[PDB]
Amino acid sequence: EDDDIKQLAAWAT
Amino acid sequence: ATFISVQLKKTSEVDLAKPLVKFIQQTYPSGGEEQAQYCRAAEELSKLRRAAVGRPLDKHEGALETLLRYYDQICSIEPKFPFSENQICLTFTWKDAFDKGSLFGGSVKLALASLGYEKSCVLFNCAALASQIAAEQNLDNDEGLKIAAKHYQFASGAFLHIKETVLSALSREPTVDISPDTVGTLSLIMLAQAQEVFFLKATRDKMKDAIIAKLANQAADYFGDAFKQCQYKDTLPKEVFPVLAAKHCIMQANAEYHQSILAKQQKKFGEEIARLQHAAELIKTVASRYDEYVNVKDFSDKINRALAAAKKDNDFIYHDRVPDLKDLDPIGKATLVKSTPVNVPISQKFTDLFEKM
């Protein structure tokens, strides 16, 4: 949910 | 692979060196080594222009960083030789990226003695190369995915920078290809494709269907708004509008399909059927309308296989009422994507050739 978006987002870095 | 990319702007070769050489030796009297060494760094700059915008097209990171270095350099040269009041004569000639120009005489070219105009078209080519590398990636590979997502966001943010900037930076009305409207639409398109990369990443990683649906729903929004920007225009190439229209419906359908797996998991079998019927209708529309542009056959089958199993068991076992779409909750939206701001330097390990001045 909120924290699975967080890890997707941080993968993009 | 049906991703939109942008062709590079053409430019005729220019001797950058001379008009600078002479403008140096005016306010640099010592014609012996030290102050006439800027004249050798001005030789590297002219060489950089020819490397960045002259070479046969390389859809590779090597070519992109050259282009980005050259953008960076031009931004560093603008204060050195004050270009607000014109005292240097240097004319850059760039052809329109999209305007064929009537074959009844001449393409669409704009020549302007302007650092403003040069750095705009340069930045355009950075965006357009980024977009081409992004689209040639292997999306069945995690690094391919990461590269695309990164390049689409770069390009999106680079088209947006031109949008905000072209008018101020130029003296004239720009060519259509770099006008704020064209370049605002390209920006949105690259942002749409960046979102779709996140949906493909989420799908690949088999993430939570609830998340995957939210990322597809947001992709559908970006693709919808882009085609609606092309609806009454014929600036972009003719494939762009129909590819965007179809992706809009392909993405709403992926949203409905993944939401319907969530519903099944929750035993809401009527809602599953309703969402799957929506998805099949959307995809049948793309198959019939946009057959030249997308290949939607296996998704149709996945959807049809699932709808058929769902109806069979609901009719025989569960007897849920199939709701109307307007009675379903809205699928949420998750955006994982932004226009990367342009804050020079944008090239790696940048060194200003004229940092002494």
Size of interface A-B (CB pairs under 8 A): 23
Q: Which residue of B has its CA nearest to A13?
A: B150
Number of domains in chain B: 1
Q: Mapped to the 3 state alphabet, what secondary structure does chain B carry? A: CCCCCCCCCCECCCCCHHHHHHHHHHHCCCCCCCCCCHHHHHHHHHHHHHHHHHCCCCCCHHHHHHHHHHHHHHHHHCCCCCCCCCCCCCCEEEECCCCCCCCCCCCCEEEECCHHHHHHHHHHHHHHHHHHHHHCCCCCCHHHHHHHHHHHHHHHHHHHHHHHHHHHHCCCCCCCCCCHHHHHHHHHHHHHHHHHHHHHHHHHCCCCHHHHHHHHHHHHHHHHHHHHHHCCCCCCCCCHHHHHHHHHHHHHHHHHHHHHHHHHHCCCHHHHHHHHHHHHHHHHHHHHHCCCCCCCHHHHHHHHHHHHHHHHHHHHHHCCCCCCHHHCCCCCCCCCCCCCCCCCCCCCCCCCCCCCC
Three-state secondary structure call for residue A9: helix
User: B211–A9: do the CB atoms touch at under 8 Å?
Assistant: no
> How many angstroms away from the CA of A10 is the closest CA of chain B?
10
Backbone conformation region of residue B96, classed left if phi is above 0, alpha if psi is from -120 to 50, else beta: beta
What are the b/e assignments for B56-77, b being 16+ CB within 10 Å? eeeeeeebbbbbbbbbbbbbbb
Query: Would you call A9 and B334 a contact, using CB atoms and an 8 Å cutoff?
Result: no
Cβ-proximal residues to B357 (8 Å cutoff; 6+ apart), any chain: B38, B80
How was this structure determined? It was done by X-ray
> For residue B334, what is the domain's CATH number?
1.25.40.280
Q: Do B201 and A5 touch (CB under 8 A)?
A: no
Residues B152 and B201 sit within 8 Å (Cβ to Cβ): no
Domain that includes residue B52, residue range: 1-357
Query: Furthest-apart CA pair in chain B: how many Å?
Result: 96
Residue to mutate among B154, B198, B335, with most A CBs inside 10 A, is: B198
User: How far is residue B104's CA from residue B120's CA, in Å, rounded to a whole number?
Assistant: 28
Cβ of A4 and B334 within 8 Å?
no
